[PDB]
Amino acid sequence: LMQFTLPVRLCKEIELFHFDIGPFENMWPGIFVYMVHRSCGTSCFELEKLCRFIMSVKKNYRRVPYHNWKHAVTVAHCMYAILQNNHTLFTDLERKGLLIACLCHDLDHRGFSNSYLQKFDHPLAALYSTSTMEQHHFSQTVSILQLEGHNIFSTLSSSEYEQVLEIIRKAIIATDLALYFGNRKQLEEMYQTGSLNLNNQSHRDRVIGLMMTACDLCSVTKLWPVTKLTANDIYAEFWAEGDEMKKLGIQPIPMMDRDKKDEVPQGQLGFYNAVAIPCYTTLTQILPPTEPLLKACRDNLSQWEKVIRGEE
Numbered sequence: 001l002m003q004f005t006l007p008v009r010l011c012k013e014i015e016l017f018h019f020d021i022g023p024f025e026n027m028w029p030g031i032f033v034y035m036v037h038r039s040c041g042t043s044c045f046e047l048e049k050l051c052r053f054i055m056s057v058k059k060n061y062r063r064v065p066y067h068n069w070k071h072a073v074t075v076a077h078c079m080y081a082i083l084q085n086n087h088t089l090f091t092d093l094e095r096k097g098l099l100i101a102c103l104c105h106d107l108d109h110r111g112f113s114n115s116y117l118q119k120f121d122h123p124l125a126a127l128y129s130t131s132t133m134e135q136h137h138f139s140q141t142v143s144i145l146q147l148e149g150h151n152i153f154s155t156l157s158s159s160e161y162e163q164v165l166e167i168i169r170k171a172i173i174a175t176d177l178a179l180y181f182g183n184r185k186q187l188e189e190m191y192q193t194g195s196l197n198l199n200n201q202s203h204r205d206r207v208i209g210l211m212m213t214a215c216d217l218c219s220v221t222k223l224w225p226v227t228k229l230t231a232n233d234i235y236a237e238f239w240a241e242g243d244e245m246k247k248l249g250i251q252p253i254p255m256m257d258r259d260k261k262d263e264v265p266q267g268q269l270g271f272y273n274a275v276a277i278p279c280y281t282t283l284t285q286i287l288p289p290t291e292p293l294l295k296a297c298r299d300n301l302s303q304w305e306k307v308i309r310g311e312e
């Protein structure tokens with residue numbers, strides 16, 4: 001049969017958490033298929049249907065600085081590395097669902113926050129009052145799954161199909177960072193009082209939610225030159241949103257005001273201390289083989305501290 005194979009450097013480095021998928025857009029579909037085949041199996045999906053799905057998913061990502069097709073594949077590769085390091089912890093349906101959820105999690109993103117849509121009074125904010133963009137990403141995911149020749153889950157039973165679409169729905173909603181803070185607090189308590197139980201479905205859901213946040217923020221877990229250059233894309237978006245806030249007559253938050261360019265190093269420090277380090281710390285407590293993510297995050301925090309100290 002038709003296994004995908006990558007050049008040697010990619011075949012070895014794709015297994016590491018800090019892998020960068022590279023600037024060759026046309027290799028990203030094959031990288032994703034490679035990851036499905038090893039994390040799920042060559043039997044998981046029909047190749048023709050899977051390729052058609054990947055290509056329609058790509059076409060539904062917009063040409064924005066950060067929440068684009070490269071972000072989708074990057075977040076899928078981090079999930080691949082988590083799954084491969086935790087072989088026996090995940091059901092067959094979770095392996096199938098979670099790489100798709102990661103590829104789909106920002107479908108049709110416009111480069112604006114939930115809060116900008118609510119202040120603009122975008123129609124999506126009337127359709128979906130919370131997790132506005134995330135309910136949209138899941139809606140786009142189901143749309144693409146229902147196109148002719150695109151049902152990659154066609155061999156699942158009714159109830160198995162409904163279970164995989166529910167894994168995907170919850171995984172995509174969990175990428176709303178507003179939801180992460182309480183999810184991580186609850187997981188911290190359950191781990192520390194030893195109530196955490198992976199046979200409890202509502203516990204798994206929380207653990208998958210945290211994995212989704214970890215994959216989504218995995219820019220902070222890369223080699224420093226990748227982390228630093230990715231931050232430029234992340235701010236290009238925020239700062240355009242700031243501009244759009246100022247056009248509505250609203251002062252943006254500091255994170256989104258290009259007038260505060262000079263404070264970026266201190267804003268990154270805050271973000272590693274308030275979001276990233278807590279995220280990968282709680283993830284490593286629950287799933288010990290993810291420790292390389294925490295280590296890499298701490299390495300980047302220390303690089304941001306050097307930037308502030310004028311050593312870079």
Ligand SMILES: CNC(=O)c1cc(CCc2nc(N3CCCC3)nn2C)nn2c(C)c(C)nc12
Nearest residue numbers: 177217219220254255260263264267268270271
């Ligand atoms: C959901 N993700 C995020 O919201 C997110 C935010 C930031 C922005 C961090 C931030 N900067 C600043 N300002 C204040 C004035 C100058 C700079 N204030 N703050 C909190 N970086 N970032 C990364 C790298 C990644 C992966 N994700 C992020």
Ligand SMILES: [Mg+2]
Nearest residue numbers: 105106133175
């Ligand atoms: Mg998102």
Ligand SMILES: [Zn+2]
Nearest residue numbers: 105106175216
């Ligand atoms: Zn994302």
